Design a protein around this ligand. Structure first.
Ligand code: CA
Ligand code: CA
Ligand code: CA
Ligand code: CA
Length: 405
């Protein structure tokens, strides 16, 4: 193909030219991504013995990641040929892609994640690129975590050593610095205009996902909204309900909290923190296999705890995890006997347990309120979160209003 022709030239050596430079590698990657016949291109490269050379010669891990994610993402019928060539290419024991943010994924696992993600994105309808909807520039206070800013938790600088020492000694002032920013939830909402609220919601859903696998997508990363819609369809939810849960968490989130969430989880301590958009707890993601619909069993079986924590920092994995767990909680609700949940019935008298089995568009508002309690706290133990239900319900009202807009 025209693309394989160019790639063969770019990776070749000459009288001069004893290396595939970073710029040549970038051109190769762009050619792969711009290609209208990617399977044909891979077939041609393999036939000429150039496929293994391609993987071996694109050296810096950051470029290897882009190359491998792009090829895994674009291939269908030649998927196996690419994977096999990648495997053969690693015989001289390169770092491959296993560095930096991706140090918890072996190189072949990186390929397999990208293949599964691209396939999921295609099948579930979130492959298509979103606009560069604007992120918040905030660096502290409520609504300054990744939901607002698009700054990935895995990209945040190491917490200052002085603070790590204070956090270790459980210093009140420093703990607060890295914890939930909101005390009185209702007081927080009371200080926002309707327009402020719609703005937050739009900021959250309108911007591209902060993803650890951007080149697995055919173009630019999809909007949060698109991924939330895909998850809503997969789990019989709505983007308004998923968005309400996430907007509540993100209002009660800061940049510093994000840094602590991630860094503690992958430290030698392997802390069980809540991570990312939906503040999914690492243990919950493992207990309930929350990536089931984006990653195959072979990939999931091999994931380390720290790999799981890292995936939770990738917005699309987090949105699917959040949504799958919401549907788990709703399904569990539908199996309950309301007579055995007198505190729940007391607090939410219009709760309809059977309705939980269906779509949120047909849920009473009390179902949204009760589920908010039972998302943040243990589900259906008849112990309720004090203020989370009205906090999420207000965000829900906003999404119904935004949906209105
Ligand atoms: Ca938080
Ligand atoms: Ca797979
Ligand atoms: Ca509970
Ligand atoms: Ca909307």
């Amino acid at each position: 193909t025209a693309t394989s022709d160019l790639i063969e030239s770019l990776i070749s050596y000459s009288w001069d030219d004893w290396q595939v430079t970073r710029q040549e590698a970038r051109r190769v990657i762009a050619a792969i991504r711009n290609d209208n016949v990617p399977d044909a291109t891979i077939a041609a490269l393999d036939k000429s013995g150039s496929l293994i050379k391609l993987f071996q010669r694109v050296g810096p891990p950051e470029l290897a990641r882009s190359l491998i994610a792009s090829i895994a993402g674009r291939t269908t019928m030649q998927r196996y040929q690419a994977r096999n060539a990648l495997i053969r290419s690693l015989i001289n024991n390169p770092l491959g892609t296993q560095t930096d943010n991706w140090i918890y994924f072996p190189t072949i696992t990186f390929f397999d994640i990208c293949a599964d993600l691209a396939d999921a994105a295609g099948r579930l309808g979130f492959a298509a690129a979103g606009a560069t909807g604007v992120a918040s520039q905030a660096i502290q206070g409520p609504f300054s975590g990744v939901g607002a800013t698009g700054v990935n938790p895995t990209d945040l600088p190491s917490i200052a050593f002085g603070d790590q020492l204070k956090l270790l000694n459980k210093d009140p002032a420093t703990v607060t610095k890295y914890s939930n920013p909101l005390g009185d939830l209702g007081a927080y909402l009371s200080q926002l205009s309707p327009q402020d609220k719609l703005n937050q919601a739009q900021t959250l859903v309108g911007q591209p996902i902060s993803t650890l696998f951007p080149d697995a997508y055919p173009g630019n990363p999809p909007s949060r909204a698109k991924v939330m819609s895909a998850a809503a369809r997969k789990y019989d939810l709505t983007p308004q309900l998923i968005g309400a849960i996430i907007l509540a968490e993100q209002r009660d989130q800061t940049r510093d909290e994000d840094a602590k969430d991630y860094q503690a989880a992958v430290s030698i301590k392997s802390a069980n923190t809540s991570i990312g958009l939906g503040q999914v707890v690492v243990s919950t993601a493992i207990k309930y296999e929350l990536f089931t619909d984006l990653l195959g069993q072979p990939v999931r079986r091999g994931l380390s705890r720290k790999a799981v924590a890292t995936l939770l920092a990738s917005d699309e994995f987090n949105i699917f995890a959040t949504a799958r767990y919401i549907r788990y909680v709703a399904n569990l609700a539908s199996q309950q006997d309301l007579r055995k949940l007198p505190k729940t019935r007391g607090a939410f008298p219009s709760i309809d347990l059977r309705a939980y089995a269906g779509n949120p568009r047909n849920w009473p508002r009390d179902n949204v309120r009760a589920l908010a309690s039972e998302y943040t706290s243990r589900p259906w133990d008849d112990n309720l979160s004090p203020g989370w239900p009205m906090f999420v319900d207000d965000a829900y009202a906003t999404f119904l209003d935004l949906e209105h807009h």
